[PDB]
Amino acid sequence: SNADDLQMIEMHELIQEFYYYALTKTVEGEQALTYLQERGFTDALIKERGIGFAPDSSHFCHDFLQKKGYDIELAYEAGLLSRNEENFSYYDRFRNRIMFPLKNAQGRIVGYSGRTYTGQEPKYLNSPETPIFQKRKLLYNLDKARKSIRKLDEIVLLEGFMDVIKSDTAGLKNVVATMGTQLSDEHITFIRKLTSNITLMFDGDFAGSEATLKTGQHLLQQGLNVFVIQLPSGMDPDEYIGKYGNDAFTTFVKNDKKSFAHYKVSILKDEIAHNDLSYERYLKELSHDISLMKSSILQQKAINDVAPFFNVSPEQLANEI
Numbered sequence: 001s002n003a004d005d006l007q008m009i010e011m012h013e014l015i016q017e018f019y020y021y022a023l024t025k026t027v028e029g030e031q032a033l034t035y036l037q038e039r040g041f042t043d044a045l046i047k048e049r050g051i052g053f054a055p056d057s058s059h060f061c062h063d064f065l066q067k068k069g070y071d072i073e074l075a076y077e078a079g080l081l082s083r084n085e086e087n088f089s090y091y092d093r094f095r096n097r098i099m100f101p102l103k104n105a106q107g108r109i110v111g112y113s114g115r116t117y118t119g120q121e122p123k124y125l126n127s128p129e130t131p132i133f134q135k136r137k138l139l140y141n142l143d144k145a146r147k148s149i150r151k152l153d154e155i156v157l158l159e160g161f162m163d164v165i166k167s168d169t170a171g172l173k174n175v176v177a178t179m180g181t182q183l184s185d186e187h188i189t190f191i192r193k194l195t196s197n198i199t200l201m202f203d204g205d206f207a208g209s210e211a212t213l214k215t216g217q218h219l220l221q222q223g224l225n226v227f228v229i230q231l232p233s234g235m236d237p238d239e240y241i242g243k244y245g246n247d248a249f250t251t252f253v254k255n256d257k258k259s260f261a262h263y264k265v266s267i268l269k270d271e272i273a274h275n276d277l278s279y280e281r282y283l284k285e286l287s288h289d290i291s292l293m294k295s296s297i298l299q300q301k302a303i304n305d306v307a308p309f310f311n312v313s314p315e316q317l318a319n320e321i
């Protein structure tokens with residue numbers, strides 16, 4: 001029910017204040033606080049994002065919610081508590097982790113992502129699916145990013161909410177991330193209401209490239225204008241910012257932004273030039289890709305940019321399309 005959803009949100013927003021205190025003031029939170037500070041989190045940024053610490057007792061959140069008069073089973077359904085199925089007892093889902101509030105599109109806290117700071121697995125532990133937290137619907141930072149996304153007519157998609165936090169403070173405001181999932185049909189429906197331009201900046205590794213191609217292809221097929229920023233090998237946006245600084249990052253992002261078709265053929269360059277079977281298949285793929293582009297201006301430019309990779313004239317490629 002809507003009333004229960006609201007109670008679940010309240011539980012999240014109230015425990016947030018306690019996690020924040022635990023992180024910033026208490027003895028047990030000191031090591032987690034140092035960890036964040038060493039990753040460049042200022043006191044201001046920690047306060048701004050409402051970041052906190054979940055103690056290791058296993059009954060910190062449980063006891064707080066109980067004292068405040070919440071139904072414990074509802075707190076379990078809200079994904080704040082876990083249940084020992086053997087004796088039906090409840091305990092904290094999040095223990096000894098740095099707590100990042102996850103806000104819905106309306107800015108209400110509906111879940112958490114808890115990061116280890118001691119090399120434990122999983123590195124990030126999220127809320128489970130609940131009536132108020134659904135990974136296929138939530139986009140980290142969307143609440144804050146919406147204004148600039150509309151103003152700039154562009155959304156930028158990163159892999160990690162940590163990348164989003166760092167990019168945002170660096171000056172790149174129109175950024176969001178999924179909670180570690182593939183961009184959903186639902187996400188895409190939300191996004192197209194805000195803008196038709198989406199820029200993918202995944203990590204600069206093989207996995208990120210594969211994800212860029214798969215996600216980009218689907219976005220393109222869905223009628224969006226897709227762009228790609230390619231980070232240096234082995235780097236994500238947080239690592240780039242840490243090594244080169246904010247101004248370098250915002251300049252980098254603004255300098256090399258390529259239409260998806262151009263990015264794709266550049267990735268396939270060597271295979272196309274060495275394997276005639278791939279040459280033919282990718283010439284047809286890229287022809288199809290370009291034919292999907294809704295922007296007549298960008299479609300014409302992509303033709304010019306892609307043709308050389310096949311050693312054909314832009315006129316020949318235009319004909320193939």
Ligand SMILES: Nc1ncnc2c1ncn2[C@@H]1O[C@H](COP(=O)(O)OP(=O)(O)OP(=O)(O)O)[C@@H](O)[C@H]1O
Nearest residue numbers: 115123124159160161162163179180181203236238
């Ligand atoms: N095996 C996995 N299963 C589910 N989600 C994952 C997995 N690996 C990564 N993710 C999610 O994808 C996003 C990107 O992961 P990645 O490890 O690159 O994060 P990150 O920002 O590098 O983390 P950190 O900088 O804190 O080490 C993260 O937010 C994470 O939640």
Ligand SMILES: [Mn+2]
Nearest residue numbers: 203205207208
């Ligand atoms: Mn990766």
Ligand SMILES: [Mn+2]
Nearest residue numbers: 159160203236
């Ligand atoms: Mn990363």
Ligand SMILES: [Mn+2]
Nearest residue numbers: 162236238239
């Ligand atoms: Mn990282």
